[PDB]
Design an enzyme around this catalytic site. Structure first.
Site, PDB file in Angstrom:
ATOM      1  N   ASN B  82       0.985  -1.320  -0.136  1.00 57.75           N
ATOM      2  CA  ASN B  82      -0.094  -0.271  -0.237  1.00 57.75           C
ATOM      3  C   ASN B  82       0.717   1.130   0.127  1.00 57.75           C
ATOM      4  O   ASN B  82       0.149   2.209   0.528  1.00 57.75           O
ATOM      5  CB  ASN B  82      -1.010   0.025   1.394  1.00 57.75           C
ATOM      6  CG  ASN B  82      -1.745  -1.141   1.295  1.00 57.75           C
ATOM      7  OD1 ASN B  82      -1.812  -2.045   2.294  1.00 57.75           O
ATOM      8  ND2 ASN B  82      -2.380  -1.648   0.156  1.00 57.75           N
ATOM      9  N   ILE B  89       1.519   7.108   0.829  1.00 57.60           N
ATOM     10  CA  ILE B  89       0.707   5.968   1.020  1.00 57.60           C
ATOM     11  C   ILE B  89      -0.684   5.755   0.369  1.00 57.60           C
ATOM     12  O   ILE B  89      -1.044   6.919  -0.017  1.00 57.60           O
ATOM     13  CB  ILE B  89       0.579   5.677   2.554  1.00 57.60           C
ATOM     14  CG1 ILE B  89      -0.523   6.737   3.109  1.00 57.60           C
ATOM     15  CG2 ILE B  89       1.730   5.964   3.301  1.00 57.60           C
ATOM     16  CD1 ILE B  89      -0.832   6.673   4.270  1.00 57.60           C
ATOM     17  N   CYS B  90      -1.493   4.648   0.276  1.00 57.05           N
ATOM     18  CA  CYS B  90      -2.563   4.307  -0.350  1.00 57.05           C
ATOM     19  C   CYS B  90      -3.490   4.040   0.866  1.00 57.05           C
ATOM     20  O   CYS B  90      -3.268   2.755   1.221  1.00 57.05           O
ATOM     21  CB  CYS B  90      -2.705   3.529  -1.499  1.00 57.05           C
ATOM     22  SG  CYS B  90      -4.180   3.430  -2.201  1.00 57.05           S
ATOM     23  N   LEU B  91      -4.143   4.805   1.364  1.00 49.71           N
ATOM     24  CA  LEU B  91      -4.997   4.482   2.715  1.00 49.71           C
ATOM     25  C   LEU B  91      -6.446   5.431   2.538  1.00 49.71           C
ATOM     26  O   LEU B  91      -6.103   6.705   2.774  1.00 49.71           O
ATOM     27  CB  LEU B  91      -4.209   4.856   3.722  1.00 49.71           C
ATOM     28  CG  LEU B  91      -4.792   4.666   5.209  1.00 49.71           C
ATOM     29  CD1 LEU B  91      -5.556   3.335   5.424  1.00 49.71           C
ATOM     30  CD2 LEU B  91      -3.992   5.005   6.322  1.00 49.71           C
TER      31      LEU B  91
END
Ligand SMILES: [Cl-]
Ligand SMILES: [Cl-]
Ligand SMILES: [Mg+2]
Ligand SMILES: [Mg+2]
Lengths: 146, 146
Positions: B82, B89-91
């Site tokens: 992620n 970040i991918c969140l």
């Protein structure tokens, strides 16, 4: 060599802090590449004249840490008996009485203790030391308007 | 105005953290003048494939915080499903699903959760997502040698 052992020790200190973070304190290194520069905050303890105030610190660790202590400075101006004009602190724990088994947690705890009870002996800021005792109301005003 | 309310909110978030510091995490702003830049670390949780590893973050808060989330980047290279190449970040918690009542503590807790369980859906690093499932031993090696 010297810097390998100091990096390992700072990572060990970091592990201690994350496992049991101390209350009243925040602290974290700038980065892994700049592991020797940490920024921290301390909050004025309950039942102290600084209660609830927030104070900002920088700790600069030398390459031979923990043989030598970090340089410790308040990075926001403070009016305190044990802090010099440039923000450096006067605290034997991180100066002449430094121990090579002290940690970042040791240091932050000891700095927080200066907001629990200032040290009146040979103060770095004599006006602050005198005012703290002689006129607590005015001392609080000088803290706030620094 | 916008920056006055964001400074007050960051100080409120700081007060929350110092009163009840979360385990597994360190975090502190660069300074009061640079209150919008925070550095943090997270330690790999027990029972995760990252157990005991230390990971380094920077959070850059916008002037209209908490209307908008901080930009969050790992500042030490990481091999994680992620996390993008530039460390972003991918969140969803700090992206499309940001809530204006989330705090620094909310954010750090949510990032730590990516080391508890990576998100396999639409991963930022598809090779890491595939390797995590297909060959955990090799995934651990790639984490270490990043
Ligand atoms: Cl040095
Ligand atoms: Cl901005
Ligand atoms: Mg303690
Ligand atoms: Mg929590």
């Amino acid at each position: 060599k010297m810097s390998s052992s100091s990096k390992l020790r700072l990572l060990s200190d970091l592990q201690q802090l994350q496992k049991d973070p101390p209350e009243g304190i925040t602290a974290s290194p700038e980065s892994e590449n700049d592991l020797y520069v940490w920024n921290a905050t301390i909050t004025g303890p309950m039942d102290s004249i600084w209660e609830g105030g927030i104070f900002f610190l920088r700790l600069t660790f030398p390459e031979d840490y923990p043989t030598k202590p970090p340089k410790v400075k308040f990075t926001s101006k403070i009016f305190h008996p044990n802090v010099y004009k440039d923000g450096s602190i006067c605290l034997d724990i991180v100066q002449d009485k430094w121990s090579p088994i002290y940690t970042v947690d040791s240091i932050l705890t000891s700095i927080l203790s200066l907001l629990e009870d200032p040290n009146p002996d040979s103060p770095a800021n004599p006006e602050a030391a005198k005012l703290f005792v002689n006129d607590p109301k005015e001392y609080k005003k000088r803290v706030r308007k620094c």
